[PDB]
């Protein structure tokens, strides 16, 4: 255990906060694309993620605000021009409905995989709109953001209003894959854009249904499914399982419709209480978690890539390597009283492989396994890692959650809900 004499709580938080931004600085390519994964050894696969352009745009504002990225406005422009197809070296692939491919080659632009992804498209668009707000005097950033927002219609992904279903993905030719996904989850991101587009796009495919969908499932929490963890109500896709915790965090940091809505904020707080309670209920032979260890996330694991979820009464069947996620714990810091202290404790614990150093000596925390304590991650997926910086940045004495609730307000002016 690292003593408070060797390193103070403040020194730890300062290191991790700067480290969380250096991550993004390293994930970013000069051409304004972002790798899917950061390799801790300095390797680069040149496999990019569209989602990480959105998260990286957000991160640029955080670095800027902290004095760590004085070029940020121009880095944001480079990324947005690249996303808009305005760099002649290559464009990111889009399918027959202008949906972006999830992954692509960051040297050549070749598509990678089969996932023409509305959600990853939506994360990119949010990041564009976030930098538009942040660099609000740059007209070219506004124009590019508006172009990206208007040119992928997400109203088409609303599948069935009465059951809360959105199509997961499209095929190359623009038809939908079979799979539908139900509220509550991170497809709130999709719904939100579709709700705005219904108002804003002249030719929205499916405007009325997108509005109706939003009004039932996401204008309030009233109709969302609830699954109870030890009597704690947790929004979910149904009553007998839990969705991913990152869904609450992505929706909160990226969408005003979540972060500015007290029902949704309360839901995120409850969800974090359930994740803590879960980790305290785990009783696996040969494992002993300390009290400060918790957070159910997605990301690299001994099995490759894992989407870890909690389940009733400490049941770890949906957490295949019994991985604990410090990016999720960090993400909770503004929303749970003990998360910050627990993140620090986690850093101090030398029996777990949570600490990682980046090139340049920067420090972060990341996923580690209780089934395989000697495992140490070799890379970090940006979409998941996002919430580490965001949670640290949203500390009250850092930028605060009001930073995100201000700059994620894409669709309203400041006095919208005030007296005229
Ligand atoms: Cl991704």
Q: Separation of 287 CA from ligand 1 center, angstroms?
A: 31
For residue 306, how far is its CA from the centre of ligand 1 (angstroms)? 13
Please, is 379 exposed, middle or buried when counting C-beta atoms within 10 Å of its C-beta (0-12, 13-18, 19+)? middle
Q: What is the DSSP letter of 316?
A: -
What is the distance in A from the centroid of ligand 1 to the CA of 10?
A: 31
416 belongs to a structural domain: no
- Please, what is the angle between helix 139-151 and helix 72-83, to 10°? 30
Cβ density class 248-263: b for 16+ within 10 Å, e for less? bbbbbbbbbbbbbbee
Q: Is 186 within the bounds of a domain?
A: yes
Cβ count near 223 (within 10 Å)? 13
Number of domains observed in the structure of the chain? 1
Q: How far apart are the CA of 330 and the centre of ligand 1, in A?
A: 19
Contact 255, 126 (CB under 8 A): yes
Angle at 352 between CA 347 and CA 353, to 5 degrees: 85
Q: How many residues does the chain have?
A: 420
390: tokens are 């965001």
Q: Does any domain span residue 420?
A: no
CA 337 to ligand 1 center in whole angstroms = 29
Q: What is the Å distance from ligand 1's center to 72 Cα?
A: 22
Technique behind this structure?
Answer: X-ray
Q: Range of 366's domain?
A: 9-407
How do strand 37-39 and strand 47-49 relate by DSSP bridges? unpaired
CB atoms within 10 A of CB 105: 17
Report the C-alpha gap between 365 and 297 in whole angstroms.
13
Sequence-ordered list of residues with C-beta below 8 angstroms from that of 209, at least 6 positions apart, any chain: 155, 158, 161
Angle at which helices 9-27 and 382-393 cross, to 10°: 140
Provide the CA 311 distance to its chain's centre, in angstroms.
21
Whether 419 is in a domain gets the answer: no
Query: What separation in Å is there between the alpha carbon of 284 and the centre of ligand 1?
Result: 31
State the resolution, in angstroms.
1.2
Domain contains 418:
no
User: Which CATH number characterizes residue 19's domain?
Assistant: 1.50.10.140
Q: Check if the beta carbon of residue 33 is closer than 8 Å to that of residue 106.
A: yes
Q: With CA atoms as reference, report the closest residue to 390 among 32, 37, 123.
A: 123
Bond from prior residue into 68 cis (ω within 30 degrees of 0): no
Tokens of 219: 């204008």
**Strand (E) or helix (H) holding 208:** helix 207-217
Could you tell me if residue 154 is inside a domain? yes
> 3-class SS at 266?
helix
- Cα of 389 vs centre of ligand 1, distance in Å, is 16
- Is position 414 within any domain? no
Contact 151, 74 (CB under 8 A): no
Q: Please enumerate in sequence order all residues whose Cβ is within 8 A of that of 417, keeping only pairs 6 or more positions apart, or say none.
A: none
* Residues, CB within 5 angstroms of ligand 1 (ion): 49, 51, 383
SS3 211: helix
* CA–CA separation, 392 and 18 (whole Å): 9
Within a domain: 239: yes
């Amino acid at each position: 255990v690292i003593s408070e004499t060797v390193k103070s709580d403040q020194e730890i938080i300062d290191s991790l906060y700067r480290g969380g931004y250096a991550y993004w600085q390293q994930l970013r390519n000069e051409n304004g694309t972002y790798e899917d994964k950061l390799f801790l050894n300095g390797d680069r696969s040149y496999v990019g993620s569209i989602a990480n352009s959105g998260m990286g745009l957000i991160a640029l504002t955080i670095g800027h605000a902290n004095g760590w990225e004085p070029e940020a406005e121009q880095l944001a422009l480079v990324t947005l021009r690249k996303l808009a197809g305005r760099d002649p070296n290559f464009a990111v692939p889009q399918n027959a409905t202008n949906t972006f491919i999830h992954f692509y080659n960051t040297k050549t632009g070749e598509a990678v995989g089969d996932d023409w992804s509305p959600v990853d498209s939506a994360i990119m668009i949010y990041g564009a709109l976030f930098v538009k707000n942040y660099f609000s005097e740059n007209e070219e950033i506004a124009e590019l953001a508006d172009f990206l927002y208007r040119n992928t219609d997400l109203t088409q992904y609303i599948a069935d209003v009465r059951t809360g279903r959105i199509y997961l993905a499209q095929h190359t030719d623009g038809t939908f894959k079979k799979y539908r996904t139900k509220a509550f989850n991170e497809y709130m991101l999709v719904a939100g854009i579709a709700n705005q587009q219904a108002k804003d796009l002249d030719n929205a495919v499916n405007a009325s249904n997108a509005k109706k969908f939003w009004d039932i499932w996401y204008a309030s929490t009233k109709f969302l499914p609830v699954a109870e963890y030890n009597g704690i109500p947790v929004l979910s896709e149904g009553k007998t399982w839990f969705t991913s915790q990152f869904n609450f965090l992505f929706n909160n940091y990226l969408m005003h419709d979540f972060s500015n809505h007290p029902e949704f904020v309360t839901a995120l707080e409850n969800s974090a209480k359930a994740d803590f309670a879960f980790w305290r209920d785990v009783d696996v032979e040969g494992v002993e978690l300390k009290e400060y260890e918790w957070g159910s996330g997605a990301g690299s694991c001994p099995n490759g890539y894992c989407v870890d979820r909690f389940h009733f009464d400490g049941d770890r069947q949906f957490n295949h390597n019994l991985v604990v996620s410090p990016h999720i714990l960090a993400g909770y810091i503004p929303f749970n009283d003990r998360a910050k202290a627990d993140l620090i404790s986690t850093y101090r614990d030398n029996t777990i492989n949570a600490k990682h150093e980046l090139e340049g000596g920067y420090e972060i925390l990341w996923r580690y396994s209780h089934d395989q304590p000697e495992w140490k991650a070799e890379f970090i997926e940006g979409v998941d890692f996002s919430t580490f910086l965001f949670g640290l940045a949203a500390m009250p004495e850092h930028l605060g959650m009001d930073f995100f609730n201000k700059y994620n307000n894409y669709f309203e002016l400041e006095h919208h809900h005030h007296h005229h």
